[PDB]
Amino acid sequence: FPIDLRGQTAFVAGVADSHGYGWAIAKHLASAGARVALGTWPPVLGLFQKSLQSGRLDEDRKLPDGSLIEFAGVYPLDAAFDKPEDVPQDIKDNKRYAGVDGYTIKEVAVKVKQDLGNIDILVHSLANGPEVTKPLLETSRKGYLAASSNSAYSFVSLLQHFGPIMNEGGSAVTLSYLAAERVVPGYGGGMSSAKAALESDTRTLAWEAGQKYGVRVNAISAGPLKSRAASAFIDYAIDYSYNNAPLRRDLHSDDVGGAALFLLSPLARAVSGVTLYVDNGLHAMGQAVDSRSMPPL
Amino acid sequence: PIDLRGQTAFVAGVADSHGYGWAIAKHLASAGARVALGTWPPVLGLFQKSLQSGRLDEDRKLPDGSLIEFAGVYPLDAAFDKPEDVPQDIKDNKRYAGVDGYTIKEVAVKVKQDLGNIDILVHSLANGPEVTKPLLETSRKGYLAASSNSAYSFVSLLQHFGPIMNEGGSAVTLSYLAAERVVPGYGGGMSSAKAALESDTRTLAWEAGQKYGVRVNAISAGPLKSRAASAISFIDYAIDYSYNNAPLRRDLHSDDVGGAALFLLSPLARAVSGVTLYVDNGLHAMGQAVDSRSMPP
Amino acid sequence: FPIDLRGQTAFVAGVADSHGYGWAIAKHLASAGARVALGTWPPVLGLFQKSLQSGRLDEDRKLPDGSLIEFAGVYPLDAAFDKPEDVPQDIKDNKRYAGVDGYTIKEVAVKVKQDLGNIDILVHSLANGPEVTKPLLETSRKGYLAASSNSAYSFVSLLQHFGPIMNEGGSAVTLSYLAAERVVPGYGGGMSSAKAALESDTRTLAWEAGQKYGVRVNAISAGPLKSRAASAISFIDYAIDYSYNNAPLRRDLHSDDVGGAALFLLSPLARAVSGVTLYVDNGLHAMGQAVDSRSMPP
Amino acid sequence: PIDLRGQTAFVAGVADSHGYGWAIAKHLASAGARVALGTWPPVLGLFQKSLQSGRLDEDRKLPDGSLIEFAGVYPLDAAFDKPEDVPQDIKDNKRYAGVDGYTIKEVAVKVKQDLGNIDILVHSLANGPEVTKPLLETSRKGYLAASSNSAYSFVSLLQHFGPIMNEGGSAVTLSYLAAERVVPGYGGGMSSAKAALESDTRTLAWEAGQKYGVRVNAISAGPLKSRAASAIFIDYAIDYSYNNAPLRRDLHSDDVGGAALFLLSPLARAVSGVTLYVDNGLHAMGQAVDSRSMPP
Ligand SMILES: NC(=O)c1ccc[n+]([C@@H]2O[C@H](COP(=O)([O-])OP(=O)(O)OC[C@H]3O[C@@H](n4cnc5c(N)ncnc54)[C@H](O)[C@@H]3O)[C@@H](O)[C@H]2O)c1
Ligand SMILES: NC(=O)c1ccc[n+]([C@@H]2O[C@H](COP(=O)([O-])OP(=O)(O)OC[C@H]3O[C@@H](n4cnc5c(N)ncnc54)[C@H](O)[C@@H]3O)[C@@H](O)[C@H]2O)c1
Ligand SMILES: NC(=O)c1ccc[n+]([C@@H]2O[C@H](COP(=O)([O-])OP(=O)(O)OC[C@H]3O[C@@H](n4cnc5c(N)ncnc54)[C@H](O)[C@@H]3O)[C@@H](O)[C@H]2O)c1
Ligand SMILES: NC(=O)c1ccc[n+]([C@@H]2O[C@H](COP(=O)([O-])OP(=O)(O)OC[C@H]3O[C@@H](n4cnc5c(N)ncnc54)[C@H](O)[C@@H]3O)[C@@H](O)[C@H]2O)c1
């Protein structure tokens, strides 16, 4: 009973495989009784649908009680585009987009409304920075703005188009990273700047959507995870966290899944505009404890 | 999703059903935990009488219709760490007659003997004898009493309970926005004590996370008409301000903080430590009041 | 002697009149002995140069000693463009841009290098959000990205192109606002998000430029000022009133107050200061509650 | 640009030339302020003698070649607000022999009598008797002594000097990053006291801004090999900062002296309630760059 989401509907944007935070969030929402629909980047939609229907993901879909999560629909969604007239001709003609239609944010919200009705829960678990491996001193304007469009404005647009079909008391969460607030070398390409914008937008939308729709908006600042996007260096980031955080333990995608479930549930009915660290306590440290400036183990 | 059956909690600072301590205890019991209370000795008799008379039956009532039951109600004076610290005047004070073994160290010993190791520790207690005084009119003695009762008491609770907490266990304390930004009327060095308390939450997250594998977090709550608050009408203005200026226009109930504390003290929060979680209808996010006399109605 | 900038050169990007923060920063730098060159948005360059030459600005140029500030040059600069190839044809042909050349960030840094040599001090005092009056729920992708391009990435680009000609121990400063950290109704169009990205880039560039160039990078989070930009959007008046009535220091905020704080951050007095956001706002940032709320008694 | 001639400063917590207090006092005097000092009474004799002997002549030398002179050096024990707070064993301690009128209230009265109103107030003093102990091993008595000596002392200084400060005057205190994020080894409840001190800086900025028109700010400083620091490791903290901060450079006491001069001057007339980091940019970092988890 403490977290009962039966009768509620969730839309989770940014799920293309079982290895990232988006999958873990969707799995927790389903285990708590929510109907869960997914938005998936259209070029990888076929591969994802194929891996679901083949039974290759059946282990990753397994719930504590032994049943398998089922999705209320898997919708193609490209969060770089708000409406059909924004999609350039090269994209519409791109073979990777052949045989999918209606994948702009506005069109997805219309389909969800038609197929499922009003929703209660909105998840933004997507990011893309084409110049992420470049330091900010070597990042182009185009790379920097692509990071911001894909990773920060996509959350604003999701709220603009889903907000109108969200029930009062409903909730939205996005994922961020400590680089928004403090310098993490290697998180380049204007991704740090985009995550800072995204946390600022979390607060501003908490105000705007709180007033207009009675909807809560929060962020989780997560620690490092070997997702498919991250492994495409991530190994060093995870070792650093393991060796320097208050809690000496592995960070699992389920750890963020569980924290998202809270922020998206009635337990969190007074919580809005927060950045909740889910990173084994690392955000609290003012000094590495394994620095070569200090004595060893 | 939150199953605390088999776990034991100790909630320090519960003397009635109107405060945040009671609401947290109630949420822990609804999720299956055994819950013991620590109560300031002069009001222990009154509280025990209220419980036993049935006066609190409505307040004890869960969703399923059972009433919460406590595994023990212990006298606890968080001003005193060991029996040697208790002055003769206190031992002889009539308000302490018929109660024994109420220092922090003694209570932790009794809990270990009666209940065994605990998983969950809650510090929901504060006392500022000069809280109505601005900081420019607060004496050293009043300021230090605020810090002793409200900040150091959390450190001492962790020092004495930490050794009897299971690995993976968790502690939470309660703070207020005045720790980070100026709230006129929260005086007597209570703002300073809450800043110390939030800093200690981080420091203890590191020390207790390393030493005990215990998580330590804080909730920064909004205004609530508790018995402590209504005795100081000012609490009424602070509530009105929040209602009129927060992202979520709704009443803030003690249950709202109870639900958030339940999360932080549960396995869903297994990667969360050292945080200050705002549970305040989003107010913390605002940079301007919206009902200022400087702006149009 | 405590702030002596004689022998140093500053470039101040985003000065088109005497009513904004950029002018006050330039004026303080000059009073401390720095040579000061300006970057000015090309469409308003003609009007600005005419004002300077006509004597209209002589009172605003006046220093405490009674001399008038002089600029080591006034350069057309459009901080939306990094290189000549980025400029679209409809801009090159726009009548507002007729008669000016070489105004991209890279070309301005080249001209500064050629005309003045290396610099010590860099100021970014420019922002532009075409949808600033729109709430975030009504702000388009195009307006949100223009706000970021003009107001946040422009600082990154300035450091990338001026960094190689900045002396070790040099210093850069930008201007932000509280809306980057907490919600201020009416600061819309993705400008709050752009200022958050700008403060984050201030820290990241402090690391990158501190390691590579030994250059310091800081931000000032300023209070409300009735500049030409602000009064063109009576909203700035309400924001000013709110600050006056709710801040720890009950006093008017003058552009010179930010000018003095920038002079510190850009001087050898600040040699150990980098990556900060310094509030210059009469203490308003420190407040957790308005004191003239209708929820409270008068 | 910064001209403090005609202004008067009181700098609490100067007992030698190696700490931040001295550097702030030196910068204030170079800018033309008259500077009085408050000195912990048990080291007052040694400090006065080192001044009068000429031993401090190099450290007193200004850029132009004159030596700073103080408007007076007052005994001050910031653990005590008024005479009746001082226990008998302190009054009788030989270290406090021959010194009188050293509670905060008394010093403020003497300053007003000797010098008149002041413009500038500096709090550069801390003491945590249990600083080497982790918080899980810190006693209540040790924790409260850290708070009394290091946080409340600033509140008391404003309460007693506030009434003799000119409108537009200014106060500054010194903090450290341990107030906001965990620094192992900064124990004894000193991290907690620095957090309370930063919070009090904000609350006093409001209270003293409204009542007196006085600005109140804090500098969060990096590690410095002062006498207090070398008595306690400080070498490891300094190395860490050198190897991990944006600016790879030594942090000198004059770096904080310069930043304090700014906060205490008319250039900062719109600045109040801030925590200004003067630490080579280290506060901005979210990761060490010489961690053994990463490659050399
Ligand atoms: N260490 C980490 O992995 C880490 C740390 C902190 C935060 N995060 C954040 O968590 C979120 C999830 O990341 P993950 O690493 O689990 O990645 P992931 O492997 O789930 O990849 C990111 C997802 O975004 C989707 N995506 C990218 N561009 C898209 C677009 N235009 N339209 C629709 N979908 C798009 C991708 O298809 C993919 O599903 C991200 O916002 C990321 O920044 C990740
Ligand atoms: N508006 C509010 O009520 C408000 C706002 C934010 C935070 N909080 C925080 O929530 C916590 C609980 O507050 P509440 O308002 O619900 O109070 P409450 O009415 O429960 O009173 C505080 C509790 O502390 C206990 N206590 C005080 N001194 C004690 C001692 N020496 N030993 C043992 N117990 C002692 C009291 O007996 C009482 O149970 C406090 O830390 C408070 O600062 C309250
Ligand atoms: N209340 C305020 O006025 C206020 C408050 C806080 C911060 N700020 C910040 O202070 C800074 C200066 O603002 P101001 O209000 O003093 O403005 P201002 O009137 O000087 O206008 C901003 C300047 O930016 C220049 N500019 C705009 N787009 C440009 C481009 N593409 N290329 C080159 N220059 C361009 C304009 O020509 C103008 O000189 C801005 O960053 C602003 O966001 C202002
Ligand atoms: N690494 C560092 O040295 C460091 C780092 C950050 C912040 N700080 C802060 O800077 C300030 C000055 O420290 P420093 O290391 O330059 O110190 P220091 O060596 O000047 O010693 C501290 C001073 O405080 C004085 N003092 C202590 N207790 C006193 C009392 N009860 N009454 C009056 N004076 C008393 C001492 O006599 C001494 O003058 C302190 O607040 C310190 O916490 C220092």
PDB file of C-alpha atoms in Angstrom, chain D residues 65-239:
ATOM      1  CA  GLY D  65      58.331  51.383   2.224  1.00  0.00           C
ATOM      2  CA  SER D  66      56.648  52.696   5.371  1.00  0.00           C
ATOM      3  CA  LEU D  67      55.678  50.315   8.184  1.00  0.00           C
ATOM      4  CA  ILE D  68      52.075  49.764   9.280  1.00  0.00           C
ATOM      5  CA  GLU D  69      51.205  51.221  12.677  1.00  0.00           C
ATOM      6  CA  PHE D  70      48.233  50.124  14.760  1.00  0.00           C
ATOM      7  CA  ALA D  71      45.812  52.522  16.491  1.00  0.00           C
ATOM      8  CA  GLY D  72      45.937  50.146  19.465  1.00  0.00           C
ATOM      9  CA  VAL D  73      46.255  46.473  20.339  1.00  0.00           C
ATOM     10  CA  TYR D  74      43.454  45.434  22.722  1.00  0.00           C
ATOM     11  CA  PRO D  75      43.293  42.228  24.729  1.00  0.00           C
ATOM     12  CA  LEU D  76      40.206  40.334  23.590  1.00  0.00           C
ATOM     13  CA  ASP D  77      38.820  36.937  24.521  1.00  0.00           C
ATOM     14  CA  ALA D  78      35.907  36.282  22.228  1.00  0.00           C
ATOM     15  CA  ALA D  79      34.637  33.363  24.382  1.00  0.00           C
ATOM     16  CA  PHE D  80      33.320  36.000  26.866  1.00  0.00           C
ATOM     17  CA  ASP D  81      30.707  38.687  26.198  1.00  0.00           C
ATOM     18  CA  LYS D  82      30.711  40.451  29.590  1.00  0.00           C
ATOM     19  CA  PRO D  83      32.769  40.431  32.828  1.00  0.00           C
ATOM     20  CA  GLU D  84      30.335  38.187  34.731  1.00  0.00           C
ATOM     21  CA  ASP D  85      30.862  35.443  32.063  1.00  0.00           C
ATOM     22  CA  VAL D  86      34.537  35.053  32.974  1.00  0.00           C
ATOM     23  CA  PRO D  87      35.119  32.122  35.385  1.00  0.00           C
ATOM     24  CA  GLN D  88      37.342  32.586  38.413  1.00  0.00           C
ATOM     25  CA  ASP D  89      40.038  30.168  37.165  1.00  0.00           C
ATOM     26  CA  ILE D  90      40.473  32.291  33.979  1.00  0.00           C
ATOM     27  CA  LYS D  91      40.645  35.541  36.011  1.00  0.00           C
ATOM     28  CA  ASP D  92      43.314  33.914  38.203  1.00  0.00           C
ATOM     29  CA  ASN D  93      45.287  32.239  35.365  1.00  0.00           C
ATOM     30  CA  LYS D  94      48.837  33.691  35.186  1.00  0.00           C
ATOM     31  CA  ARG D  95      48.446  33.951  31.374  1.00  0.00           C
ATOM     32  CA  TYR D  96      45.636  36.520  31.998  1.00  0.00           C
ATOM     33  CA  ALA D  97      47.622  38.238  34.767  1.00  0.00           C
ATOM     34  CA  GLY D  98      48.022  41.994  34.301  1.00  0.00           C
ATOM     35  CA  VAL D  99      45.400  42.219  31.568  1.00  0.00           C
ATOM     36  CA  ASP D 100      41.905  43.649  32.117  1.00  0.00           C
ATOM     37  CA  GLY D 101      38.764  44.587  30.158  1.00  0.00           C
ATOM     38  CA  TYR D 102      39.049  41.834  27.537  1.00  0.00           C
ATOM     39  CA  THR D 103      35.410  40.699  27.152  1.00  0.00           C
ATOM     40  CA  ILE D 104      33.754  41.661  23.850  1.00  0.00           C
ATOM     41  CA  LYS D 105      31.457  44.239  25.476  1.00  0.00           C
ATOM     42  CA  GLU D 106      34.377  45.883  27.304  1.00  0.00           C
ATOM     43  CA  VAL D 107      36.576  46.043  24.211  1.00  0.00           C
ATOM     44  CA  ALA D 108      33.796  47.724  22.193  1.00  0.00           C
ATOM     45  CA  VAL D 109      33.410  50.321  24.995  1.00  0.00           C
ATOM     46  CA  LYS D 110      37.198  50.997  25.023  1.00  0.00           C
ATOM     47  CA  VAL D 111      37.281  51.316  21.248  1.00  0.00           C
ATOM     48  CA  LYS D 112      34.381  53.812  21.270  1.00  0.00           C
ATOM     49  CA  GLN D 113      36.165  55.801  24.042  1.00  0.00           C
ATOM     50  CA  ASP D 114      39.644  55.762  22.446  1.00  0.00           C
ATOM     51  CA  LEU D 115      38.821  55.910  18.744  1.00  0.00           C
ATOM     52  CA  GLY D 116      35.151  56.857  18.268  1.00  0.00           C
ATOM     53  CA  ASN D 117      32.866  55.130  15.767  1.00  0.00           C
ATOM     54  CA  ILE D 118      34.359  52.555  13.403  1.00  0.00           C
ATOM     55  CA  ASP D 119      33.624  51.676   9.786  1.00  0.00           C
ATOM     56  CA  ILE D 120      35.168  48.226   9.414  1.00  0.00           C
ATOM     57  CA  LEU D 121      34.981  45.083  11.538  1.00  0.00           C
ATOM     58  CA  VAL D 122      36.944  41.848  10.947  1.00  0.00           C
ATOM     59  CA  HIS D 123      36.455  38.535  12.658  1.00  0.00           C
ATOM     60  CA  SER D 124      39.473  36.286  12.002  1.00  0.00           C
ATOM     61  CA  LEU D 125      39.444  33.845  14.895  1.00  0.00           C
ATOM     62  CA  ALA D 126      38.468  30.238  15.563  1.00  0.00           C
ATOM     63  CA  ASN D 127      39.188  27.599  18.132  1.00  0.00           C
ATOM     64  CA  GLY D 128      37.971  24.029  18.313  1.00  0.00           C
ATOM     65  CA  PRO D 129      39.520  22.094  21.174  1.00  0.00           C
ATOM     66  CA  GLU D 130      38.543  18.746  19.588  1.00  0.00           C
ATOM     67  CA  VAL D 131      39.365  19.598  15.978  1.00  0.00           C
ATOM     68  CA  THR D 132      41.442  16.407  15.465  1.00  0.00           C
ATOM     69  CA  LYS D 133      38.501  14.187  16.471  1.00  0.00           C
ATOM     70  CA  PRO D 134      35.974  12.851  13.950  1.00  0.00           C
ATOM     71  CA  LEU D 135      32.399  14.060  14.642  1.00  0.00           C
ATOM     72  CA  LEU D 136      31.506  10.480  15.824  1.00  0.00           C
ATOM     73  CA  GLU D 137      34.122  10.970  18.609  1.00  0.00           C
ATOM     74  CA  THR D 138      33.432  14.658  19.486  1.00  0.00           C
ATOM     75  CA  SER D 139      31.965  15.405  22.938  1.00  0.00           C
ATOM     76  CA  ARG D 140      29.107  17.870  23.501  1.00  0.00           C
ATOM     77  CA  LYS D 141      31.501  20.126  25.463  1.00  0.00           C
ATOM     78  CA  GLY D 142      34.040  20.171  22.609  1.00  0.00           C
ATOM     79  CA  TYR D 143      31.368  20.761  19.970  1.00  0.00           C
ATOM     80  CA  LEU D 144      29.768  23.633  21.848  1.00  0.00           C
ATOM     81  CA  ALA D 145      33.208  25.184  22.563  1.00  0.00           C
ATOM     82  CA  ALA D 146      33.889  25.188  18.777  1.00  0.00           C
ATOM     83  CA  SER D 147      30.552  26.915  18.212  1.00  0.00           C
ATOM     84  CA  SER D 148      31.058  29.415  21.073  1.00  0.00           C
ATOM     85  CA  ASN D 149      34.588  30.387  20.052  1.00  0.00           C
ATOM     86  CA  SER D 150      34.124  30.342  16.307  1.00  0.00           C
ATOM     87  CA  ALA D 151      30.468  31.131  15.391  1.00  0.00           C
ATOM     88  CA  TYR D 152      28.768  32.922  18.287  1.00  0.00           C
ATOM     89  CA  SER D 153      31.843  35.157  18.751  1.00  0.00           C
ATOM     90  CA  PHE D 154      30.946  36.782  15.375  1.00  0.00           C
ATOM     91  CA  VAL D 155      27.332  37.366  16.449  1.00  0.00           C
ATOM     92  CA  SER D 156      28.547  38.917  19.723  1.00  0.00           C
ATOM     93  CA  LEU D 157      31.052  41.121  17.894  1.00  0.00           C
ATOM     94  CA  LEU D 158      28.257  42.542  15.693  1.00  0.00           C
ATOM     95  CA  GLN D 159      25.949  42.993  18.699  1.00  0.00           C
ATOM     96  CA  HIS D 160      28.558  45.106  20.548  1.00  0.00           C
ATOM     97  CA  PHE D 161      30.289  46.851  17.653  1.00  0.00           C
ATOM     98  CA  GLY D 162      27.115  47.332  15.528  1.00  0.00           C
ATOM     99  CA  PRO D 163      25.974  50.245  17.724  1.00  0.00           C
ATOM    100  CA  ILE D 164      29.306  52.096  17.075  1.00  0.00           C
ATOM    101  CA  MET D 165      29.603  51.373  13.369  1.00  0.00           C
ATOM    102  CA  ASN D 166      28.908  54.110  10.815  1.00  0.00           C
ATOM    103  CA  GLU D 167      26.097  53.622   8.291  1.00  0.00           C
ATOM    104  CA  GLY D 168      27.598  52.003   5.199  1.00  0.00           C
ATOM    105  CA  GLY D 169      30.215  50.249   7.371  1.00  0.00           C
ATOM    106  CA  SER D 170      31.094  46.654   6.815  1.00  0.00           C
ATOM    107  CA  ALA D 171      32.009  43.411   8.619  1.00  0.00           C
ATOM    108  CA  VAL D 172      33.676  40.236   7.336  1.00  0.00           C
ATOM    109  CA  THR D 173      34.420  36.819   8.772  1.00  0.00           C
ATOM    110  CA  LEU D 174      36.416  33.791   7.574  1.00  0.00           C
ATOM    111  CA  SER D 175      34.998  30.363   6.853  1.00  0.00           C
ATOM    112  CA  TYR D 176      36.072  27.209   5.045  1.00  0.00           C
ATOM    113  CA  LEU D 177      34.537  24.731   2.461  1.00  0.00           C
ATOM    114  CA  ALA D 178      34.018  22.127   5.231  1.00  0.00           C
ATOM    115  CA  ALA D 179      30.849  24.146   6.130  1.00  0.00           C
ATOM    116  CA  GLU D 180      29.229  23.044   2.839  1.00  0.00           C
ATOM    117  CA  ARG D 181      30.974  19.791   1.926  1.00  0.00           C
ATOM    118  CA  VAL D 182      32.828  17.137   3.806  1.00  0.00           C
ATOM    119  CA  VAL D 183      36.569  17.636   4.439  1.00  0.00           C
ATOM    120  CA  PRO D 184      38.052  14.674   6.424  1.00  0.00           C
ATOM    121  CA  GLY D 185      40.249  15.859   9.340  1.00  0.00           C
ATOM    122  CA  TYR D 186      38.355  19.091   9.958  1.00  0.00           C
ATOM    123  CA  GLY D 187      36.657  17.628  13.039  1.00  0.00           C
ATOM    124  CA  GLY D 188      35.585  18.584  16.567  1.00  0.00           C
ATOM    125  CA  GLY D 189      32.397  20.222  15.307  1.00  0.00           C
ATOM    126  CA  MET D 190      34.440  22.930  13.521  1.00  0.00           C
ATOM    127  CA  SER D 191      32.686  22.099  10.211  1.00  0.00           C
ATOM    128  CA  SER D 192      29.354  22.587  12.022  1.00  0.00           C
ATOM    129  CA  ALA D 193      30.527  25.864  13.524  1.00  0.00           C
ATOM    130  CA  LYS D 194      31.638  27.197  10.133  1.00  0.00           C
ATOM    131  CA  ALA D 195      28.195  26.295   8.673  1.00  0.00           C
ATOM    132  CA  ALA D 196      26.495  28.199  11.546  1.00  0.00           C
ATOM    133  CA  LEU D 197      28.927  31.078  10.899  1.00  0.00           C
ATOM    134  CA  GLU D 198      27.959  31.296   7.172  1.00  0.00           C
ATOM    135  CA  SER D 199      24.250  31.105   8.072  1.00  0.00           C
ATOM    136  CA  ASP D 200      24.778  33.869  10.674  1.00  0.00           C
ATOM    137  CA  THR D 201      26.576  35.984   8.059  1.00  0.00           C
ATOM    138  CA  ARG D 202      23.281  35.911   6.045  1.00  0.00           C
ATOM    139  CA  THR D 203      21.019  36.476   9.050  1.00  0.00           C
ATOM    140  CA  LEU D 204      23.213  39.358  10.364  1.00  0.00           C
ATOM    141  CA  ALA D 205      23.383  40.814   6.804  1.00  0.00           C
ATOM    142  CA  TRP D 206      19.573  41.126   7.053  1.00  0.00           C
ATOM    143  CA  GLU D 207      19.481  42.307  10.721  1.00  0.00           C
ATOM    144  CA  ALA D 208      22.482  44.636  10.637  1.00  0.00           C
ATOM    145  CA  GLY D 209      21.661  45.825   7.121  1.00  0.00           C
ATOM    146  CA  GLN D 210      18.205  46.969   8.304  1.00  0.00           C
ATOM    147  CA  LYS D 211      19.173  48.281  11.724  1.00  0.00           C
ATOM    148  CA  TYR D 212      22.592  49.890  11.044  1.00  0.00           C
ATOM    149  CA  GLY D 213      22.980  50.023   7.262  1.00  0.00           C
ATOM    150  CA  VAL D 214      25.985  47.711   7.747  1.00  0.00           C
ATOM    151  CA  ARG D 215      27.063  45.011   5.237  1.00  0.00           C
ATOM    152  CA  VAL D 216      28.097  41.602   6.526  1.00  0.00           C
ATOM    153  CA  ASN D 217      29.960  39.022   4.390  1.00  0.00           C
ATOM    154  CA  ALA D 218      32.175  35.927   4.707  1.00  0.00           C
ATOM    155  CA  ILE D 219      35.256  34.736   2.850  1.00  0.00           C
ATOM    156  CA  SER D 220      35.582  30.990   2.468  1.00  0.00           C
ATOM    157  CA  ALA D 221      39.359  30.652   2.358  1.00  0.00           C
ATOM    158  CA  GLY D 222      41.722  27.902   1.167  1.00  0.00           C
ATOM    159  CA  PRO D 223      44.400  26.241   3.390  1.00  0.00           C
ATOM    160  CA  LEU D 224      47.166  28.423   4.852  1.00  0.00           C
ATOM    161  CA  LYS D 225      50.127  27.382   7.012  1.00  0.00           C
ATOM    162  CA  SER D 226      49.270  29.814   9.821  1.00  0.00           C
ATOM    163  CA  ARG D 227      50.560  29.184  13.364  1.00  0.00           C
ATOM    164  CA  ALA D 228      47.121  27.805  14.368  1.00  0.00           C
ATOM    165  CA  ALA D 229      47.175  25.416  11.349  1.00  0.00           C
ATOM    166  CA  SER D 230      50.767  24.147  11.862  1.00  0.00           C
ATOM    167  CA  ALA D 231      50.076  23.364  15.562  1.00  0.00           C
ATOM    168  CA  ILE D 232      47.461  20.684  14.750  1.00  0.00           C
ATOM    169  CA  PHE D 233      48.496  17.682   8.004  1.00  0.00           C
ATOM    170  CA  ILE D 234      48.179  21.325   6.887  1.00  0.00           C
ATOM    171  CA  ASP D 235      50.971  20.383   4.399  1.00  0.00           C
ATOM    172  CA  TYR D 236      48.702  17.684   2.891  1.00  0.00           C
ATOM    173  CA  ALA D 237      45.760  20.071   2.598  1.00  0.00           C
ATOM    174  CA  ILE D 238      47.991  22.628   0.828  1.00  0.00           C
ATOM    175  CA  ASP D 239      49.337  19.958  -1.550  1.00  0.00           C
TER     176      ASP D 239
END
